[model samples]
Target: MDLTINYKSTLGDDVAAYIYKETNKPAGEWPGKTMTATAGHEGWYTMHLTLDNSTDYSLILNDDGHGNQLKDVTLSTKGKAEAEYWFDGSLSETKPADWKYVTTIHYLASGMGSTIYNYMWGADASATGAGVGKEWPGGQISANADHLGWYDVVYTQDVKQNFSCIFNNNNGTQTDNIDVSVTSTSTELWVTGTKGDTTVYKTAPDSWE
Candidate 1:
C-alpha cells in the first residue's frame, strides 16, 4: 500500500519526514525525506510513502530549521491499498473534526548529566500500556532542535487522568517521581539542574547554565 502525509506547519519552516519500519531501521538517513509544499495550500507540506501489509511503520516530522519536530508518529496501514493523513503539530489520525483541540504535554529535559530517560505510568500502576505508561528507564528523550543542551518528549494524553514520570540518566542518577497532571493541553515542562537537584519549570527559563 501507499501513504500520503499532508503536514501543516505552524513554524513556517521546511519539513522532512523520517520513515522507519517496525524493526526500527530507517528507510534513509536522519532528516529522512524532504516533503514538497502542496500547491495552493499555505504552510502545507506533503510526502508519499510505500507500505507493507505485514509490517508496521512510524515516522518523525522535522522542521528543517531549529530542530523543531514531531516524533514517533505511527502510521496505520492495514488492509487498505492507500492511506492519507493530515497532521498539524499534534497527534491525530484524521483531519481534525473541529477547531477546538487539546494540546500535548511537551517535556523538555536539560543538564541531566547524560542522555535523559523518561519513565511514565498512569494513575493505576497495573495500567501500563503503550500510551498510558512504560517500563523502567522509559524512552530516551530526543534532543531539542532549537535548544542546544535540551532534549524533549511529547505525550498526547487525557487531561483528566493523572500520570507520573521520572527522568534519569540510566546510571543511578535520576529525579524524584513527578506528577504530570495538567488542566489543559498547552503544557510545557522544562526539567533542569543536576542529577540530585532537578527542577521543573512551567515557563521557559532565561538560561540553562
Candidate 2:
C-alpha cells in the first residue's frame, strides 16, 4: 500500500523536519519506516512511504530543525491500509487549516471616542506585549449612543494555550482583562468587553441576542 504524509503551516518559511516509525517486528525484520522532505516549498512538505497492508503502523515526527517535535501525532491505519497519502494530500495531513489562530475584539464601551490598545502575554506568559499597534497612536473608537465598536486585531499564536488581553483606555481609563480560552478545534475567536464592566465575555461572531 502507498502511504503519504503532508505538513503545512504559515509559521515561517525556514523549517526542516522528519518523521519516524517503529514496529514490534523482529530485530532485523522490516523494522518500520520514515519519511523525510520529499517535496516541500512555500511552507508545505510531503513525504511518501509504501508498506505491506498487513503491517501495523504508528508514527511520530521530529523537528530536526525547528525544535518543534510533534508527539502522538499519528493515526493508526486500523486495518484499512488503503493506498493514499498519510497526512498531507486528500488522504491525511496536519490539517493546518483546522487550527484556530485569529482573534477579534468586539468591545462596547461606556465612554465615547476614547482610544484603546490591545495587550497580551507572549509565548511564556511573563510580561505582555502590545499587538499590531503598540506605544504608538492608540486605537480610537468612532461610535455613538451605545458606543459599540471594536479593534480588528488578529493573533497567530498557539490556540491550544490560554492567554489574556488587557484593554487599556488611551484616555487614562480602563475596563477589564479579557481572559481568553482557546482550542485547536476553533476556527476564529470573538470577545466582548465594556468600560467599567468587570466581566469580559466570549461568543461566536454570529451569536447575538
Candidate 3:
C-alpha cells in the first residue's frame, strides 16, 4: 500500500534526511532501499513510502546542523495505509517525563451517580476569555458507579499555561468553569463531595485522600 511519512528533526535549518527501512517485504528488499526526504521548511521532512506489510524504519539526519549524523530516530509502523511521525529531540534534548495533572474524584452519589450520563470536563487557559474552554471529547464516566468515585486521572500537558477543567453531568453550562493550577512544579488536584453537595478540591499528590 501507499504510505507517506512526515517528520521533523531536532536540528532545524539545512539538512538531508534519509529513511532506512529494515524489514522483509515485496519486490523492494528491506535495508536495500534508502529513500531521501524532501525538505519542507526548516528541519521538517517528508517521504512517500510503499510498504508491502507492517514494518520498522528509522530516520537518519545526514549533514544535520548538529553533526555529520546528528540523530537517528527509530520507530515502527502498524498495518496502516499512511502514517506520520512528528518531530522530537535527541535523548539529552528532551525533558524528563513527569505528571501534568493527577486528579481524583469522589463525586456525590446524589449529584452524580448515574453511569448513563457523561460527565464532561475541559481546561481553559483563561476563563475570562471568549471561550468557556475546550471540552475533552471523551467525557468522563464513573469508575465505581455505586460509590460514584474516580481516581488517578493522570494526564500530561505540554503547554505552560494555567488551565482549569469545567464540568457537570452532561455539563450544559459554560459559566461554571472549575479553575485548577497545573504548573510544571504544581500538578496535583482532587474533587471530593458528600451525598448532597458540590465538589471540593484537595491539594497535592503527597496527601491523596
Candidate 4:
C-alpha cells in the first residue's frame, strides 16, 4: 500500500538498467526509488514515485545523486528485462537478512546519441538531485516512502497505475528509445505503525509531528 511500481521499456537497440541497495533500502536507514539507463544513445527517461495521491509521480533520466554508480551505470539491470527491489520483506515482513528483492522495475530504452546521468546531483532534496554524494543528497529519502513516500495509507485504488522507465542517453552514444509496460499492484492496503516484517523506522501515519 505504501509504494507502487513504475517503469519504462527500451525502444530501439539500447538496454535498460536499475539498482536497489540492500543497505539503503527502506528497511535500512534510508528509503526511496530510482531508475537508470545508458549514457550515449538516446536513453532519455525519468519517473516519479509518490505517496500522497495529490502529488504527481514522474520518472526522469538525465542526472545523478540517486545511486552508488556514476549515473547508475548499466551494470545492474541491463537488457535483463526484469523488475527488482532490495527488500525481502513481504506482507509478513519477517526477514531481516540480506536477500533478493521481491519486485522488479519495468523500463524502456532506445539507441540514439546522448549521455544521461541518473546519479548526478541537483540543487534541492528530491529524486532530481540527491545522489550527488553531498552531505544531504537531493534524492527523496523517507522511512515509509513506499509509493515513493506514502507509508500512511495501505494501497486501495484501482491502485494499479501503468508506468514506464524511458531509458535515454545522456548526450554521447546511441540507444534511441524503447517502451516497456509496468503495473503496480496492492490489495490489503491500510496505514499501520509497522508490519514487523522488518525494521521500518518511524514508519506510521499517526506520527506526523
TM of each candidate vs. truth: 0.44, 0.39, 0.31, 0.17
* Residue pairs whose backbone atoms clash in candidate 2: 4-86, 6-88, 87-92, 87-93, 88-92
TM-score: model 4 vs. ground truth: 0.17
Query: Residue-wise lDDT of candidate 2 within 1-209, one digit each (tens)?
Result: 44545555333433333333454421123212323333323445444444555545555443434545454454454466433333442236354543333344455544535566655553333222245334423334343333245544445544445666666665655656666654322213444545555554443343322
Q: By descending TM-score, how would the candidates be arranged? A: 1, 2, 3, 4
Off by over 4 Å in 2: 1-93, 97-100, 124-148, 185-187, 193-196, 205-209
lDDT of 3: 0.40
Report lDDT (Cα) of residue 1, candidate 3: 46
lDDT of 4: 0.25
1-209, model 3: which lDDT tens digit per residue? 44443345444444454555554432243222332343323444544445544666565655432355645676555565434344445422222343122233333323443431223235433222212333442344445433324522333344435555534444332214445544322234455443244355543232333
Put down candidate 1 lDDT per residue, 31-69, tens digits, no spaces. Answer: 777877764466878766555756667878887624586
- lDDT for each residue of candidate 4 in 1-209, tens digit (9 for 90 to 100): 13323223323223222333422222112223343331221333222232332222222222232332123221122233332222111112222232211112211122332222222222122212222332321122223333432322111122122221212233443222212222222212122121122112212223333
Off by over 4 Å in 4: 9-32, 36-50, 62-209
Order the candidate numbers by lDDT, best to worst: 1, 2, 3, 4
lDDT of 2: 0.44
Candidates in order have lDDT scores of 0.61, 0.44, 0.40, 0.25
Best by lDDT: 1
